[PDB]
Design a protein around this ligand. Structure first.
Ligand SMILES: [Ca+2]
Ligand SMILES: [Ca+2]
Ligand SMILES: [Ca+2]
Ligand SMILES: [Ca+2]
Ligand SMILES: [Ca+2]
Ligand SMILES: [Ca+2]
Ligand SMILES: [Ca+2]
Ligand SMILES: [Ca+2]
Lengths: 143, 233, 233, 233, 233, 143
């Protein structure tokens, strides 16, 4: 049942304070302990971009909504797979490093493969040079 | 992060080396000002093109401070930036001294107040100089605007030139603690030096404030910050 | 709308503060002109970069007037803009006075006609100065053109510089009611001041007209777009 | 087509009006040159921004000639352009005379050779001046290149400035028949005037040649020209 | 490849012709420096616009060398480039001599050290001059950066201007072997000429190194791209 | 049979010289009589962009290939209708003025409707504000 322990400790790492929520305030504390001092307002913007309640309080299950469903819409696992297919030009379950650079260069940012390579083999499980579904969730849930 | 620190170090050495170097001599101000104003301006525009994409080309403690209170950099980077800028300046001033003939060395273009200008007036001048300067930096660095910006390196540089065209007669135009510091610590002369830290710093603070924040029209300051969580999560 | 009003207010204060400040002193004109022409030009280019995306950076009643008769702003914004610009200028001139040593203050760079220049000739000069100026503003602000514009802030600023390089010998180059007003109301001297409102205003009006009441093409433009369409077929 | 003709007319009037106006007086050359070089350069950069998208901002017979032998305009447009530019210049020179005090009028900045410069040497100088100038115009106007061009108006203007920074000491730098003509026909002095038509024209021809053609990556010179058939077919 | 060689040849002739030509005469340095600094800078900015898209506009052996050790061109192109640049310079200097009146010719603006500047100090100066110069070239030519660069031709040109604003008092600012060579071989004077090959070459080497052997960011740059990817998700 | 007379005189207007070809040389003559003097080379480039022979000699039928088939590929009337459908976002036989501006602005040229309006109501038969098939051929074959 190993995913049920990984999705425990990959939240416990940020909820040292026990109340069962990741709040905007602790998004401030972690950055403050790391020797920053953010603006507080743009902690709400980046979270309500996904937050199902609109609330700024990302409870035990809603943190897993934020990493595996990525919308305010209950079961967006299939919307992650169609958001893969907006980036793909085939839909084979796998976003190539080349397909990621295709869609990024389609916005006119004329950039390089070498600064997408530093963010696929940060967590690549199968080594292949594309990005599968469970790899994409774990590449936002390193533990 | 360390490449950027090196950028700030070399850019500050070059900035001070060329700025101070081109300021050696005298005049009443006439073509002297135009020339020194342009030298600093072009030194900055040059360096902002050279390392602006690598570290943001602050090459100025006051500018870095501006970005700190503006919440665009960490307290850690800021201090490292200022450290690099201070040592960078001193080195440039040093290397400048080593290759420049005495008699021409003078006081190494030490920022100085005009006899008829009180230190209080001089501090207000330094504040306005740095204020329009920082305001130009924030506005031109702002990703949320213009496709008709042209070179932001030149804009910033010409802003610095403007600061000199006006300020040199009053305070020799510091607009940069590091640039004032370098000549100071090497000539063992800190008379009125407080003006050259306080003015720029306050001016830089007012500019950052006057402009801020990265809301309205938001968006990319939220996106350029969610990956600062994902690289820390 | 109120952010833009604040933009126009601060930009006018800065514009006048730095423009007037850099104009303090004398000369026959030689390097004096070059320096003052550049100061104003760079002050504008700086401010247009700083707040051009926020209010259009008019910092000039005549420029705002130009945009009014050009039907690009409401009668309400225009007046608020001019109000902000007039108070903005006065403040900058004020703050300038407060930090500048007397003897150097002179008449705070009050726009003045040359003895051998009649007020009628001076008004025609001010008209041409503002006309090429406004024409450059309209053309460069025009969204319907160029991807090779570079910085429109610099273009506009250099247009202002050009106006000074030519005009200073004649009228000290006003090209901006607010900039002429500020020195005027603080030195209690409105001799020939009419020139500095009438010339820019008429010039601004002629520029706005000359550009948009040229009226527009059409046919060669269309052929150059059917060209890019068959450049894709 | 007639809007462009008006553009060339007004731009030439402004160009000559401001260029000549800023040239009135003397000097040995020192800051005089810098100032006049910048005035012309900025007058052009300003006008190229103002009407470059409307007529290509030739404001120069030699430049238009360059574009003719370069096969980028019709024999009809060229002549109309030059007609507009010649009358445009004369008018600007005229209006300049009318608003300028005598004594300062001099010879209205008539292009003149330096005593120690033969007319043959002066013609070669004028050729090189116009050659680098036209070469910069062709290269920067060329649609087949750069996204790092910045403002082509400034590039062209600074090219003109360069021509003056070098040429004024030799020939006062004509680089433009129309600009030389205007002062000539109004002061009834055509001494050495041949230099100011021949040099630029030959230089313009050599630049167009040296660069040319819109071969061999071709492509928008072909699609911009299939529509000139479709508007005639 | 041969078009580019011709580009480097003509650009070097023009560069030297206009740079040297505008340097003829004297002064203490005041407006002389400003004028010569601008002439070279604008000559380069002009030529980089003119042939930068055709050959990269090196017009400088030291710059070409920089690109060689930077592994951006073949050993074959480099040598052909330098050959073209050396003959190009000599020709421009030649044509300059032929059209310039004696007495004004002087030593054809031969790069020269200041009496109080040792050849060792002068070589370090030339190194820093060329170093910031090359660094600006590499950074601005770098395809991997900025959409806010504006004109890289102007950036590079203003970098050259900066080098002169500072360096002329020390070494007349060479920053270019070919530009120093031309005056040298035509006046049969190679006193201290070693400075003008060694400084730029070493400076060019250090700049190429400092920039590409810094080596590159990486991780903040990557997080700035994942930021634009979630800026789209 | 009115199209067989229109496609006679809409060629006769350019073949005053009887030999049954539109050549690059007469593309020079018409422009020379209209007081121009082109380069001669880029008469070949604009024609070989369509020319079926590659030949620079656009005979009586090949001129009608150049205006109604627009490729080097014998019966490209259906390729004109799929080249309409590359510009459309529906395929209704009609390219809107809005659809023309959509595909032009997709290359980043940020232009206006008012300078496309002048190249639809230069020949618009039905007045509607889109462009049909026979209108597109006649809008390159005015007579
Ligand atoms: Ca908690
Ligand atoms: Ca919740
Ligand atoms: Ca795929
Ligand atoms: Ca994988
Ligand atoms: Ca025939
Ligand atoms: Ca055939
Ligand atoms: Ca349709
Ligand atoms: Ca229709």
């Amino acid at each position: 049942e190993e995913q049920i322990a990984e999705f425990k400790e990959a939240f416990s790492l940020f909820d040292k304070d026990g109340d069962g929520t990741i709040t905007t305030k602790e998004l401030g504390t972690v950055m403050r302990s790391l020797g920053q001092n953010p603006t507080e307002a743009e902690l709400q913007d980046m979270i309500n971009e996904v937050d199902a309640d609109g609330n700024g309080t990302i409870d035990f299950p809603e943190f897993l909504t934020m990493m595996a469903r990525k919308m305010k819409d209950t079961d967006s696992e299939e919307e992650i797979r169609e958001a893969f297919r907006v980036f793909d030009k085939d839909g084979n379950g796998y976003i190539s490093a080349a397909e990621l650079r295709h869609v990024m260069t389609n916005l006119g940012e004329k950039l390089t493969d070498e600064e997408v390579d530093e963010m696929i083999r940060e967590a690549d499980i199968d080594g292949d040079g594309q990005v599968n579904y469970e790899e994409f969730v774990q590449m936002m849930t390193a533990k | 992060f360390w490449r950027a620190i090196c950028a700030e170090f070399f850019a500050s050495l070059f900035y001070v080396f060329f700025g101070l170097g081109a300021s050696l001599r005298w005049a009443p101000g006439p073509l002297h000002v135009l020339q020194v104003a342009l030298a600093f301006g072009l030194a900055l525009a040059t360096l902002v093109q050279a390392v602006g994409h690598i570290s943001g080309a602050h090459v100025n403690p006051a500018v870095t401070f501006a970005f700190l209170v503006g919440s665009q950099m960490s307290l850690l980077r800021a201090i490292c930036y200022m450290v690099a800028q201070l040592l960078g300046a001193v080195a440039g001033a040093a290397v400048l001294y080593s290759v420049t003939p005495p008699a021409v060395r003078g006081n190494l273009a030490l920022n100085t107040l005009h006899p008829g200008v009180s230190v209080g007036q001089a501090t207000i001048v330094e504040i306005f100089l740095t204020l329009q300067f920082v305001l130009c930096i924030f506005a031109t660095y702002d990703e949320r605007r213009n496709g008709r910006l042209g070179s932001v390196a030149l804009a910033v540089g010409f802003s610095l030139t403007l600061g000199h065209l006006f300020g040199m007669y009053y305070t020799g135009a510091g607009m940069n603690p590091a640039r004032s510091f370098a000549p100071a610590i090497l000539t063992r002369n800190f008379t009125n030096h407080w003006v050259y830290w306080v003015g720029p710093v306050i001016g830089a603070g007012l500019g950052s404030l006057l402009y801020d924040f990265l809301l309205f029209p938001r968006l990319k300051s939220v996106s350029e910050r969610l990956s600062i969580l994902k690289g820390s999560r």
